[PDB]
């Protein structure tokens with residue numbers, strides 16, 4: 001029985017480029033988390049309490065996703081390397097602009113996963129593609145959700161009354177098409 | 179005991195023009211179903227989740243109506259003839275325009291039933307008029323309902339804020355005058 | 357943020373050949389639905405009430421599968437294109453012949469999914485392969501189920517007594533090997 | 535306020551031909567009742583206990599239908615005239631032959647109602663057509679049911695094993711397509 005780079009018994013070695021890509025993706029998830037925290041603060045500063053609660057929960061969810069990836073590296077007997085985290089964007093001219101950044105952040109999180117997926121396929125790492133499959137599934141739902149929230153906010157066309165209505169939807173937990 | 183055209187024991191023969199009219203009406207119900215599916219998709223594409231849920235349910239209801247008619251032909255020992263189904267309309271310039279097509283589709287479904295009803299009366303087919311009576315009753319309620327939804331959407335006069343409010347009514351199941 | 361062909365925010369563009377293949381597959385699911393409806397009617401005409409109830413439920417299930425695909429296109433910000441639907445087959449010389457068509461229809465539904473799957477792999481569309489994976493899993497179970505029903509009906513070898521016994525199994529919901 | 539022929543206050547006079555037709559129809563219902571009793575006895579004599587229980591219940595149901603008609607005449611302030619009742623048929627060569635007589639009896643009961651219906655329409659007696667409407671509805675279901683039982687017995691093709699299976703279905707209350 002061989003020992004992996006993190007010291008645990010090694011079921012199968014992992015290509016170092018794939019390892020680096022997973023460690024980098026963990027940073028992407030952590031950065032999405034602090035970005036959603038920053039968005040929750042922006043909404044709270046404008047009394048958009050429902051949007052604030054939504055993004056506060058998304059920040060915690062994205063952090064959980066990052067930890068889920070750290071656990072996979074542990075399971076593969078690979079080292080984690082928690083990286084410096086950039087400061088998030090913190091200023092937006094409108095809720096519609098913020099929601100566009102949020103949608104792009106969600107799509108970019110999926111692109112990061114897709115990049116890791118392709119590397120695993122090139123290295124025939126079927127454990128990693130299996131691990132990623134349900135995360136891509138979740139990303140489809142999150143992209144559908146964020147397209148819904150962005151599209152609904154854009155439909156409001158900057159009308160405060162419509163934005164108050166949507167804010168109350170989010171406070172109630174009405175955050176998807178259903 | 180005679181055998182009917184579908185092979186079962188025949189309680190009373192049915193005029194072939196009336197049979198053809200019922201088979202055609204089943205197509206009308208099936209076409210209303212796929213039309214409501216198309217309308218549900220149009221609403222989902224615009225984040226009108228309550229309208230989407232409403233029309234998704236109406237599509238399933240109209241299909242059930244079609245099956246209800248197929249069961250009547252079985253009960254009368256008559257052959258079913260499931261027909262080619264046209265593609266539905268799929269593009270509208272506004273929710274108000276979509277709701278006008280929906281109302282017209284409901285009224286046209288009733289006109290189809292009325293045409294079958296008149297043919298049954300000309301042929302003294304009292305089983306068929308009795309079968310249709312409760313379906314006409316249901317159509318009165320559906321026409322009242324769709325006039326309500328169309329009228330409420332028109333009252334909104336294209337204001338996104340009012341349409342968001344109505345959308346949430348539909349999501350909650352508030353779809354009739356009550 | 358770019359807008360997709362259906363107007364929603366676009367997480368990632370989809371190759372038009374893959375889009376066409378998904379729209380065509382939706383037609384396959386809708387056609388399986390109306391085929392199972394036709395089979396349910398054939399069984400009802402012969403007093404095979406358990407087979408009638410089984411195929412009535414399968415028709416509703418296949419329609420749900422089609423709608424599930426329409427929702428995926430919405431989630432990917434792609435246009436739906438609901439197509440003309442052919443009339444189903446409606447005549448069979450025996451229950452065994454009907455069950456053979458049913459098995460073939462289920463296998464052909466899987467082949468359609470497999471064709472879409474291969475196109476997604478050629479286009480590196482990992483969202484689509486992830487979306488399809490559980491549907492292939494369900495198809496394995498449905499193929500196993502339909503091979504079971506077909507094989508059991510063939511074992512009966514046209515004996516009405518055995519077919520009545522199997523009919524009652526289906527009425528009770530005994531439709532798989534278990 | 536005028537008094538009707540049975541002595542009660544008269545809401546609206548009834549044409550004597552229509553009255554005679556209703557009194558005759560009551561005899562038809564009573565005759566269906568004793569016919570089903572005779573059929574229940576025939577089945578009991580052959581140990582077909584499920585068929586016996588079914589027809590015993592149908593005999594009681596048909597009697598209830600007759601009483602329902604006597605109550606309508608009371609409600610219309612018309613005289614009842616309970617008539618001599620013929621002896622039922624009591625001999626059949628096979629269960630299939632018995633079931634054919636049963637189906638014909640059910641269809642003939644509907645024809646009797648239809649004859650009364652047409653007379654009421656000629657006399658513009660809307661109370662009577664309204665009274666008869668739900669009874670025709672029930673007849674559609676009974677005709678569907680008896681076509682089901684007859685067709686299933688014919689499918690058995692005289693095989694005692696299949697007839698025992700069907701007998702047990704009836705004992706369990708499985709008497710319709712469902």
Ligand SMILES: [Cl-]
Pocket residue numbers: 094095096097153157158
């Ligand atoms: Cl805004």
Ligand SMILES: [Cl-]
Pocket residue numbers: 272273274275331335336
């Ligand atoms: Cl509008």
Ligand SMILES: [Cl-]
Pocket residue numbers: 450451452453509513514
């Ligand atoms: Cl067979």
Ligand SMILES: [Cl-]
Pocket residue numbers: 628629630631687691692
């Ligand atoms: Cl027999």
Ligand SMILES: [Fe+3]
Pocket residue numbers: 029032061062065066109
């Ligand atoms: Fe994440």
Ligand SMILES: [Fe+3]
Pocket residue numbers: 032062105106109142
């Ligand atoms: Fe995310």
Ligand SMILES: [Fe+3]
Pocket residue numbers: 207210239240243244287
């Ligand atoms: Fe309908």
Ligand SMILES: [Fe+3]
Pocket residue numbers: 210240283284287320
């Ligand atoms: Fe309708």
Ligand SMILES: [Fe+3]
Pocket residue numbers: 311312667668
């Ligand atoms: Fe009525």
Ligand SMILES: [Fe+3]
Pocket residue numbers: 385388417418421422465
């Ligand atoms: Fe399917």
Ligand SMILES: [Fe+3]
Pocket residue numbers: 388418461462465498
């Ligand atoms: Fe299938």
Ligand SMILES: [Fe+3]
Pocket residue numbers: 133134489490
């Ligand atoms: Fe999977």
Ligand SMILES: [Fe+3]
Pocket residue numbers: 563566595596599600643
């Ligand atoms: Fe009766």
Ligand SMILES: [Fe+3]
Pocket residue numbers: 566596639640643676
């Ligand atoms: Fe009867």
